[PDB]
Design a protein around this ligand. Structure first.
Ligand SMILES: COc1cc(Nc2ncc3ccn(-c4ccccn4)c3n2)cc(OC)c1OC
Length: 262
């Protein structure tokens, strides 16, 4: 997927990544329409080390192709090293949700959860374990199209997302499709909470002991009990008792149609 700077146009910085600033911009191939794209840059990439860690995200994404998973489009492996990928115009799901709280309908909330479950159903069919499913890792493409990102797992380098992680992940570093379901459960909770973080105001160490106590994130105000009951299953302490995505995906569809026609 090698590209050439000659066809890329750097625009406004859109945020800082783990390796460098991220700029939005556009890629343009001649008789081909110009397409918006994000350009991840890496300031310390002259260092072989840092580069390997930076480009790894592209190698990973190079294996996927799903409508709800941020797409890789190319990479400029020479220098300065850049990774070019699809542009999600509306930003991160957390902000988008906090800003459109009193403006987004419930059905759109469930629809986002559903679209994410489809992307995850797909990764589970490829036996891929993401490891960090969280609202903060979801980009918004349109009012009715969410996408999953952060395959480079920015939060596991060197920050430990204890409050999103499955117990076995914290306690034993065990990451499996089942732990991804536990996380997706918290992510559903965030979406419904309009981008508020889980267990805010609770010390990690404390969240852990609470889970083992059977306590779980409370039901989001105005959350259909059917949806919360589905989150509660994603949070079964015993990983084997957690549902898989083919099933989450089928129930979210149901629940979505019920919130639609109602
Ligand atoms: C940083 O969140 C944003 C992302 C996007 N677009 C977007 N599209 C593709 C990618 C790929 C990576 N990122 C990204 C952004 C910041 C930090 C790390 N990655 C991406 N972000 C657009 C934004 O402007 C509204 C934006 O600010 C809210």
């Amino acid at each position: 997927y090698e590209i050439q700077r000659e066809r890329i146009e750097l625009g406004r910085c859109i945020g800082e990544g783990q390796f460098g600033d991220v700029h939005q911009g556009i890629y343009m191939s001649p008789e081909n329409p110009a397409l918006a794209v994000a350009i991840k840059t890496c300031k310390n990439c002259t260092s072989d080390s840092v580069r390997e860690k930076f480009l790894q995200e592209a190698l990973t994404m190079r294996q996927f192709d799903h409508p709800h998973i941020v797409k890789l489009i190319g990479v400029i492996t020479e220098n300065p090293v850049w990774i070019i990928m699809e542009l999600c115009t509306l930003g991160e799901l957390r902000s988008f949700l906090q800003v459109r709280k009193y403006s987004l309908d419930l059905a759109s909330l469930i629809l986002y959860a559903y679209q994410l479950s489809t992307a995850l159903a797909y990764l589970e069919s490829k036996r891929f374990v993401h490891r960090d499913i969280a609202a903060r890792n979801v980009l918004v493409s349109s009012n009715d199209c969410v996408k999953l990102g952060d395959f480079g797992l920015s939060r596991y380098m060197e920050k430990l997302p204890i409050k999103w992680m499955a117990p076995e992940s914290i306690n034993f570093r065990r990451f499996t499709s089942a732990s991804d379901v536990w996380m997706f459960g918290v992510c559903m909770w965030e979406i419904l909470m309009h981008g508020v973080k889980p267990f805010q105001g609770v010390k990690n160490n404390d969240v852990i002991g609470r889970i083992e106590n059977g306590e779980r994130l409370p039901m989001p105000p105005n959350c259909p009990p059917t949806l919360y009951s589905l989150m509660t299953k994603c949070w079964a302490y015993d990983p084997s008792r957690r549902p898989r995505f083919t099933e989450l995906k089928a129930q979210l569809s149901t629940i979505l149609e019920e919130e639609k026609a109602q």
